[PDB]
Amino acid sequence: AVDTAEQVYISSLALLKMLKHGRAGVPMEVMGLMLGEFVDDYTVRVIDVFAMPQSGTGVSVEAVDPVFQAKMLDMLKQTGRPEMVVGWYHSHPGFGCWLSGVDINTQQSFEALSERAVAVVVDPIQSVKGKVVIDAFRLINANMMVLGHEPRQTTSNLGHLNKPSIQALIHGLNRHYYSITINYRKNELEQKMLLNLHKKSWMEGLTLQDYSEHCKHNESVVKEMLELAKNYNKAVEEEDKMTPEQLAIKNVGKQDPKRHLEEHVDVLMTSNIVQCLAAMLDTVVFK
Amino acid sequence: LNAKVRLLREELQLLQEQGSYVGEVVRAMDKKKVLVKVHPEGKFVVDVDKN
Amino acid sequence: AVQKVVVHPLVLLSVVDHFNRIGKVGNQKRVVGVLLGSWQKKVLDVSNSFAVPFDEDDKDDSVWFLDHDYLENMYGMFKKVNARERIVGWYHTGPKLHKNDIAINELMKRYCPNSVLVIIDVKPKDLGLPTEAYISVEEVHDDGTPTSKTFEHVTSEIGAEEAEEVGVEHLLRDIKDTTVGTLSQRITNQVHGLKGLNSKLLDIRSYLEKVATGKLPINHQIIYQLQDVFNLLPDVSLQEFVKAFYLKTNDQMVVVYLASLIRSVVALHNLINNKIANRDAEKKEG
Amino acid sequence: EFLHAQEEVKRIQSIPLVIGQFLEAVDQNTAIVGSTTGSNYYVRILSTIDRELLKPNASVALHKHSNALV
Amino acid sequence: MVLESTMVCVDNSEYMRNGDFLPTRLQAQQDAVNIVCHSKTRSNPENNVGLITLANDCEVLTTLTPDTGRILSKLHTVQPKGKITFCTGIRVAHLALKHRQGKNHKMRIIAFVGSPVEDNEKDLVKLAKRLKKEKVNVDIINFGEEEVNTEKLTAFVNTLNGKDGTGSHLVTVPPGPSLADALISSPILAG
Amino acid sequence: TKQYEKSENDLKALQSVGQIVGEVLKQLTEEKFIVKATNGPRYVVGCRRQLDKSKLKPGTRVALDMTTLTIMRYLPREVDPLVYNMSHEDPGNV
Amino acid sequence: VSLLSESYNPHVRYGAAMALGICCAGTGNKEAINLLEPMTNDPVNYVRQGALIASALIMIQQTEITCPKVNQFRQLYSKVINDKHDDVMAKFGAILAQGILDAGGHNVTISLQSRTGHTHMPSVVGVLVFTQFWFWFPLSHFLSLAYTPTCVIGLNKDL
Ligand SMILES: [Zn+2]
């Protein structure tokens, strides 16, 4: 009866399990289950994500095993957090994550047990890394087609969510379905260490080991690697010294390009890496 | 420069469903329409094109 | 045997969040769970894991007990959903292990031939790369004492494959990445001296402390031997290190010359094209 | 945010793609490219690398629908 | 039916290898384990019963579970050699009872002590006052040989509970030959 | 009576669509396989973990997904008229 | 703020249109209007809305003879609301802006600075809560306190 703008609070642990369970199923679409708590109608949060076992029949409304749920919920009841399940998610690896006739068939099953049961779709493919990626859906009632279907209140998040639109298949879900916003929450402590873990991964353990191994490198074959840089500086420059003359022939910067052009920036940056890692010698080797 | 990476997104959207074709005019017509023949396809006839 | 291990941020987080599970209910001790590893080569890799309820009585301060049936059912579920995943060992959040942890490995050694235990740290503080990795082996001794089981250190590194790099790099939204060539090498250059110092300084305070308090042993045997190895290197000129001077500078010779070589070229293209595009473009407008 | 924008241009389309034959670039920012479907298409060139890998004739991999050079 | 979780403790101490019980204490107490596990089966299906070894270093062979197949599997080739350990033998059962799923199930422990113990009176009094706070009720049945007319354990059970608590009953075996199945007849009829 | 239900349960497995055939031209990376359909179009796709990457090889008949367009199952060889070239029969001998 | 109005994200462009809206509403500055012209042309939806309300605060009690863009804008307000292709979001602030220009039957305006030299707190408080009208729709009524009467009262004394 009451329809409002919605919001999904995700946990740092949740997304990581989403994209993993989805990566192992490629190409075939998997079946996950969303775990969290319903705080009210206009907001929702997902505090946990657990993986379901695959089946040979595939994604289906019968793919959820009741005995598996009671077992897993045993393991979650004895855990510090025995929170009730909320909704379900499935991966859509090879396309633009549109809900199919199989997804709707299990939507009406979750809407009778759970009032909301937010539908979530996650795919690793459509995003290299830094995208927020994922997706989220909600089933609107089809029997309401006689009354007003056009909420919400606080239309801000509605406007940013429906955008960009973004092709056609995405718009084909505006009817019978509506999306729901997603926003991260911190949890900034563990996030701080989670940054330093990957960053320190590139760093050494003792930190004096691989830098001194790059000092063993600092004269290898580095005089030979500097001969590699010397050949790039002869070969690229004697053909980039004809370019100031050719600029007088074409008059002046019309297309072009050749190329054979620039590329000395990378040569200077690699030579600068060489001279700095070499400058570490006098610091390290000495005391 | 931040606007160019956004421009690639919108431009991608216009070229995504159909991109753009390559036509060959066999004849031009009096109604401002232009008979165009595509290599893989059959002959069309299409109009202004104000530019 | 085992050389190095790779622990993903996903499974690591899976330890931390369970620390939030038992955090609200408390109370004492530390989180203890069984690690799920993936072994593709002599190098070890970890993907996921599962927590297990564990409680240590105090009377009984060396009493430790795990759930075997729950272990069976949960590992059976993870073997069902993932055929490649298997238990490589166990893990605890420490921060420092206790003498009692020697038998914990001996229990589950029926599950895996060699079970590697991985300490972790839920609260990042010091002194650098986190967690830890230990392998259970028997080196005996030259004394002829009964065989003593002492865990040996295995170098650990944080890594990932593909999808697990996505979320990790996405959630930070903090520091520049990387950036190679400018601020990647210099910051780590200070990290080399800083993390070298504090490691050496805490441990070298330990060495002075070990002879005053902590005896026995301590010292001997392992201490004096590595002591003389530390006295193996002064380590400078005389002599040949004098001769490395001018060839290091001579390695800088061509580098400075190449520098000044392209510096004039940058100024060339920039100044020429810009001054033309400045005055010749403005003269047509006004 | 600019370094973060580089990932926005590499993000699309990641995988997968459809091969075609590069024909020629009619100008800067857009080209004509023959698809493996056997059709020449007026198509934009990706804003990152427009130049060194172009070449007069080379097999180029395109997005399924957009036929976009990558 | 009454809700509870029982934890049985089999006696593997080096004094149980003798044949004073017919035919041997190993098979005698094994048949005792069969009758108690079938008794809990006839009581309630929800009650689950694991086992714990008291001798040498205590280890849980079978975690708390409603099926007795695993229990009967571990009774065999147990290799009963070692020194009995008592003070930690109740606390281990309590340790597995803190990890239980059901909070409605009451904590109950049964143990068989067939060897003398070196536990001092102060240690046992501390555990008595501790189990009062934890409310845990332990029903012990003494087997084997010990101090004639066992005293320390008897007073341990009496001082462990009070008002009523009806309760914990310690049945001491009299020094005479008899079949084990006839010794379990009195405890199985009434606590 | 129950055998019928066995068949009907087989239909539930028939709700899975047939995959699309193709060949392996090369592979650019482990997540980039240069493939071609028997109908002519060429594609580059990644694949799942159930493959053995070395087993792939160039010039390999494979089956692709209907959306991801990637290898799930594969078969080495097929030919229609062969068994019919083998189906000739003649008496004798004698 | 001219350069912040050119920012890549429309969130800062929205705040940047609002700054010129609320600060310059007591003035007839034309530079502010000039920077708010391209804002309604941005392809982002809500930033256009922001330009509507801001341009509604610069034109309070000011007729066409004040700045030449008054009618220019007044046709745009109705144009965006009668077109079905436009976003419902952008056409909300259109009729809302028509309400700003016509507030009190054109007889009243908003003034954050009395001539005495002190700021009027019901005005400021009303408008600042009115900053985000999405999050709570009844918060749009607090703008009524910002409306102040502009009149010449020649009452001599008493009644
Ligand atoms: Zn689906």
From Swiss-Prot, chain A:
It comes from Homo sapiens (Human). Belongs to the peptidase M67A family. PSMD14 subfamily. GO terms for molecular function: endopeptidase activator activity; K63-linked deubiquitinase activity; metal ion binding; metal-dependent deubiquitinase activity; metallopeptidase activity; proteasome binding. Zn(2+) binds at H90, H92, D103. This is 26S proteasome non-ATPase regulatory subunit 14. One of its GO terms (cellular component) is nucleus. The keyword DNA repair applies. It comes from the Eukaryota. It is an enzyme of class 3 (hydrolase). Keywords: DNA damage, DNA repair, Hydrolase, Metal-binding, Metalloprotease, Phosphoprotein, Protease, Proteasome, Ubl conjugation pathway, Zinc. Its EC number is 3.4.19.-. Pfam families: JAB, RPN11_C. The modification Phosphoserine is found at S127, S201.
UniProtKB/Swiss-Prot annotation, chain B:
Changing R9Q: In a colorectal cancer sample; somatic mutation. It comes from the Eukaryota. It is found in: Cytoplasm; Nucleus. Belongs to the AAA ATPase family. Component of the 19S proteasome regulatory particle complex. The 26S proteasome consists of a 20S core particle (CP) and two 19S regulatory subunits (RP). The regulatory particle is made of a lid composed of 9 subunits, a base containing 6 ATPases including PSMC5 and few additional components. Component of a complex with USP49 and RUVBL1. Interacts with PRPF19. Interacts with TRIM5. Interacts with NDC80. Interacts with PAAF1. Interacts, in vitro, with the thyroid hormone receptor (in a thyroid hormone T3-dependent manner) and with retinoid X receptor (RXR). Interacts with ERCC6. Component of the 26S proteasome, a multiprotein complex involved in the ATP-dependent degradation of ubiquitinated proteins. This complex plays a key role in the maintenance of protein homeostasis by removing misfolded or damaged proteins, which could impair cellular functions, and by removing proteins whose functions are no longer required. Therefore, the proteasome participates in numerous cellular processes, including cell cycle progression, apoptosis, or DNA damage repair. This is 26S proteasome regulatory subunit 8.
From Swiss-Prot, chain E:
There is a cross-link at K122 (Glycyl lysine isopeptide (Lys-Gly) (interchain with G-Cter in SUMO2)). Residues 5-188 form the VWFA domain. One of its GO terms (cellular component) is proteasome regulatory particle, base subcomplex. Keywords: Isopeptide bond, Phosphoprotein, Proteasome, Repeat, Ubl conjugation. Coiled coil: none annotated. It comes from the Eukaryota. One of its GO terms (molecular function) is RNA binding. GO terms for biological process: proteasome-mediated ubiquitin-dependent protein catabolic process. Belongs to the proteasome subunit S5A family. Component of the 19S proteasome regulatory particle complex. The 26S proteasome consists of a 20S core particle (CP) and two 19S regulatory subunits (RP). The regulatory particle is made of a lid composed of 9 subunits, a base containing 6 ATPases and few additional components including PSMD4. Interacts with NUB1. Interacts with SQSTM1. Interacts with UBQLN4. Interacts with UBE3A. Interacts with UBQLN1 (via ubiquitin-like domain). Interacts with DDI2. The 2 UIM motifs are involved in the binding to a multi-ubiquitin chain in a cooperative way. This is 26S proteasome non-ATPase regulatory subunit 4. The chain holds residues 1 to 191 of 377 of the full protein.
Curated annotation (Swiss-Prot), chain G:
PC repeats lie at residues 15-49, 50-90, 93-125. The modification N6-acetyllysine is found at K84. Component of the 19S proteasome regulatory particle complex. The 26S proteasome consists of a 20S core particle (CP) and two 19S regulatory subunits (RP). The regulatory particle is made of a lid composed of 9 subunits, a base containing 6 ATPases and few additional components including PSMD1. Interacts with ADRM1. Interacts with ZFAND1. Component of the 26S proteasome, a multiprotein complex involved in the ATP-dependent degradation of ubiquitinated proteins. This complex plays a key role in the maintenance of protein homeostasis by removing misfolded or damaged proteins, which could impair cellular functions, and by removing proteins whose functions are no longer required. Therefore, the proteasome participates in numerous cellular processes, including cell cycle progression, apoptosis, or DNA damage repair. Belongs to the proteasome subunit S1 family. This is 26S proteasome non-ATPase regulatory subunit 1. The chain holds residues 637 to 795 of 953 of the full protein.
